[PDB]
Amino acid sequence: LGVEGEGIWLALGTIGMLLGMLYFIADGLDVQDPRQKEFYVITILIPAIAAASYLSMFFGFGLTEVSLANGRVVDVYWARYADWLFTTPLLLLDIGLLAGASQRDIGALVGIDAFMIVTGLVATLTKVVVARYAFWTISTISMVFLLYYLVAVFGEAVSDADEDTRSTFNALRNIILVTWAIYPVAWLVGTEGLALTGLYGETLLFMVLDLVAKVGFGFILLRSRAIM
Amino acid sequence: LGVEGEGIWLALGTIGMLLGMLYFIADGLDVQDPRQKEFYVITILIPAIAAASYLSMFFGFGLTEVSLANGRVVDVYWARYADWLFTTPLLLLDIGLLAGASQRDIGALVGIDAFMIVTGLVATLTKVVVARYAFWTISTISMVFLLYYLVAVFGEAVSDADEDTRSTFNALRNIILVTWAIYPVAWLVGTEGLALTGLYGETLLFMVLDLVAKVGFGFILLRSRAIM
Amino acid sequence: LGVEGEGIWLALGTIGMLLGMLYFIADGLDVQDPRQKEFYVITILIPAIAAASYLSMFFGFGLTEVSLANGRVVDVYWARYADWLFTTPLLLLDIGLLAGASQRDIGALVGIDAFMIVTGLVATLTKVVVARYAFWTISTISMVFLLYYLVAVFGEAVSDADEDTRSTFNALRNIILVTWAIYPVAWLVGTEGLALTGLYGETLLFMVLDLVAKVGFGFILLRSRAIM
Ligand SMILES: CCCCCCCC/C=C\CCCCCCCC(=O)OC[C@@H](O)CO
Numbered sequence: 001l002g003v004e005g006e007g008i009w010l011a012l013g014t015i016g017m018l019l020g021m022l023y024f025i026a027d028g029l030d031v032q033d034p035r036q037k038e039f040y041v042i043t044i045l046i047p048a049i050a051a052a053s054y055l056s057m058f059f060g061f062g063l064t065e066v067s068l069a070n071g072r073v074v075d076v077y078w079a080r081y082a083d084w085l086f087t088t089p090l091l092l093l094d095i096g097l098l099a100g101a102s103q104r105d106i107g108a109l110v111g112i113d114a115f116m117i118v119t120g121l122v123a124t125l126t127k128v129v130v131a132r133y134a135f136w137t138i139s140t141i142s143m144v145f146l147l148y149y150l151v152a153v154f155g156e157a158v159s160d161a162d163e164d165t166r167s168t169f170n171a172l173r174n175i176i177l178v179t180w181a182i183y184p185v186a187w188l189v190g191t192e193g194l195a196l197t198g199l200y201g202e203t204l205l206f207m208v209l210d211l212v213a214k215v216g217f218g219f220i221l222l223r224s225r226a227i228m
Numbered sequence: 229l230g231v232e233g234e235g236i237w238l239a240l241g242t243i244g245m246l247l248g249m250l251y252f253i254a255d256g257l258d259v260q261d262p263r264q265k266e267f268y269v270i271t272i273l274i275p276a277i278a279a280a281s282y283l284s285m286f287f288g289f290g291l292t293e294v295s296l297a298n299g300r301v302v303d304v305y306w307a308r309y310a311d312w313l314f315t316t317p318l319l320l321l322d323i324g325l326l327a328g329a330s331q332r333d334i335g336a337l338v339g340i341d342a343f344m345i346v347t348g349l350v351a352t353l354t355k356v357v358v359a360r361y362a363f364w365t366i367s368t369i370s371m372v373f374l375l376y377y378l379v380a381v382f383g384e385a386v387s388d389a390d391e392d393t394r395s396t397f398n399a400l401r402n403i404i405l406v407t408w409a410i411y412p413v414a415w416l417v418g419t420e421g422l423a424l425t426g427l428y429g430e431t432l433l434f435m436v437l438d439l440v441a442k443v444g445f446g447f448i449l450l451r452s453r454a455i456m
Numbered sequence: 457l458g459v460e461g462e463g464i465w466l467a468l469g470t471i472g473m474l475l476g477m478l479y480f481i482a483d484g485l486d487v488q489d490p491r492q493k494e495f496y497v498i499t500i501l502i503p504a505i506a507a508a509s510y511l512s513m514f515f516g517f518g519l520t521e522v523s524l525a526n527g528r529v530v531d532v533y534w535a536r537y538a539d540w541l542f543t544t545p546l547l548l549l550d551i552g553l554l555a556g557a558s559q560r561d562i563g564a565l566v567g568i569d570a571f572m573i574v575t576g577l578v579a580t581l582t583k584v585v586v587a588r589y590a591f592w593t594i595s596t597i598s599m600v601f602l603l604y605y606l607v608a609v610f611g612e613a614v615s616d617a618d619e620d621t622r623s624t625f626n627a628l629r630n631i632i633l634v635t636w637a638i639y640p641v642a643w644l645v646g647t648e649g650l651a652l653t654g655l656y657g658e659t660l661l662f663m664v665l666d667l668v669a670k671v672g673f674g675f676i677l678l679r680s681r682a683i684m
Pocket residue numbers: 103104107108110111112114115118119122494497498505508509512518535538539542546
């Protein structure tokens with residue numbers, strides 16, 4: 001249900017995340033390697049958070065209307081940003097730990113990533129049209145260089161790891177590059193920006209992206225000898 | 229004194245936390261070993277935070293009305309969640325340091341704890357009746373993990389410590405086990421859930437639990453020779 | 457431009473922060489020593505955050521009305537507190553890293569700093585007049601501790617460092633001591649407190665303080681031989 005029938009995607013996202021979280025738990029039962037276990041904890045928590053936020057959005061909790069100075073009324077599922085505020089740093093930690101990056105470097109990218117999500121939230125909530133696009137631009141600039149440092153910095157951290165770890169890192173990095181880069185596009189073309197698609201199309205697109213960025217990513221990470 | 233007299237518990241809550249804080253400050257005046265001091269810092273901050281939360285609640289800040297879809301109007305003190313979001317990980321850090329658990333395992337427990345509290349916040353704030361109980365169930369499920377992992381994982385980390393540390397950990401763990409487990413019962417029987425009792429009684433329940441879970445917990449910890 | 461023309465300071469503050477972060481970036485293009493690089497990252501993020509917050513206030517997001525219990529209405533720029541909740545701990549990390557303070561010492565100061573900002577936010581948002589001043593007092597007391605522990609505990613940690621590190625620390629410490637201590641005065645005299653001045657003058661004062669506490673501080677830190 002929802003405002004425009006977009007609830008079907010909120011329900012399926014809820015289910016997709018829960019099934020991924022559950023697979024990950026059953027797959028991690030017979031691991032007691034402390035470092036391997038850490039990868040399971042992180043990678044289970046991520047779709048747990050998302051499942052919870054997707055369910056709250058299904059029930060209408062993360063949903064607010066914003067009347068823009070435009071007169072337009074935007075149906076904002078703000079609970080997304082609550083989800084992303086924690087899971088995108090957890091995702092960055094996950095791949096940082098695989099790459100063997102330093103704590104300096106991981107914290108640097110999480111700080112960058114947080115700035116990306118919070119300026120995206122301001123873009124999403126502010127009523128001043130120019131500010132919405134001003135902050136979407138601010139946020140997209142931070143994403144571009146987050147992705148650059150992810151490639152340049154974590155890439156060089158892993159450059160001295162074994163070949164299985166570098167290859168798992170390359171796959172995970174690639175999932176992030178293609179999948180995360182589309183989020184600002186969905187915001188732009190969905191109802192919070194140019195409104196090229198409705199709340200239904202926009203919610204479907206974030207569902208596909210979230211499921212790939214979390215369950216797809218987690219599956220590839222947890223199935224890789226690199227973490228053993 | 230509040231909406232339905234509960235101000236008395238908020239006031240006495242304030243005073244007990246503040247007195248607990250002041251005691252802990254007084255008792256750690258000439259502590260200089262870094263590790264012992266760490267315990268004092270954590271264990272002083274915990275009632276500092278709760279005291280501030282109770283005071284804000286006493287004054288009516290952090291009180292909200294929530295109109296449920298069934299027409300019931302619930303007087304929700306949401307400031308508790310602000311408190312718990314920070315004191316419950318600090319409590320977990322406090323006993324994890326005692327147990328000598330890895331920062332992996334404390335972060336793991338802190339992650340489940342945060343999930344517990346925020347899903348509790350959603351259950352308390354959402355208007356949809358079924359969603360309230362849905363998120364109460366996800367949060368209680370997370371609390372069962374947390375406690376299992378508290379007992380299982382911190383217990384094994386404290387198994388190689390001296391005997392005063394093991395016994396101090398056992399005491400503290402039992403305080404968490406008993407008192408923490410009653411919070412979901414409190415929510416369920418109080419005005420946010422089945423309304424078996426009213427906000428006055430529900431507030432009394434939480435005050436008692438907070439004071440045990442923080443001042444009494446902190447008393448047992450700081451008084452122990454295991455912290456030297 | 458804003459409520460009372462104070463928007464001029466929000467724009468100049470925006471541009472001032474932006475230009476400080478651009479200077480810092482330009483300054484650190486060829487830094488590759490990790491410790492040196494960490495100082496740059498933190499000290500770039502700080503004005504980046506202040507710039508985004510100032511911009512959002514300029515566009516009126518994070519502006520809100522708070523109507524007190526006595527009928528007075530306060531134009532509350534609450535986005536300040538979102539800015540301060542993150543940049544004041546980063547500033548503490550910066551100088552605590554400079555001072556070679558332990559992670560225990562830094563976390564302690566950051567915990568006190570976080571309490572200072574949140575009780576400041578309560579003071580600013582609460583409607584009960586007595587409460588605003590009670591939480592301003594609470595917040596200011598925490599600041600006195602913070603500044604004291606900064607002087608004592610970071611000063612003690614830097615006491616073993618070389619001549620340029622101590623000297624750089626002293627200058628940074630003194631910037632913190634004089635500039636930070638003026639914020640509660642600004643709150644007290646501005647529209648949040650006694651309203652001796654209005655939002656215009658209040659916003660000018662916070663602008664000057666932020667720029668000195670962030671760009672000025674950043675300049676002194678990043679130009680110092682100590683971080684080499
Ligand atoms: C009105 C909204 C304005 C924007 C608010 C944005 C707030 C979020 C921004 C940043 C929060 C994340 C801070 C992240 C802080 C990272 C600091 C760091 O790099 O430390 C390295 C050391 O730990 C190594 O030992």
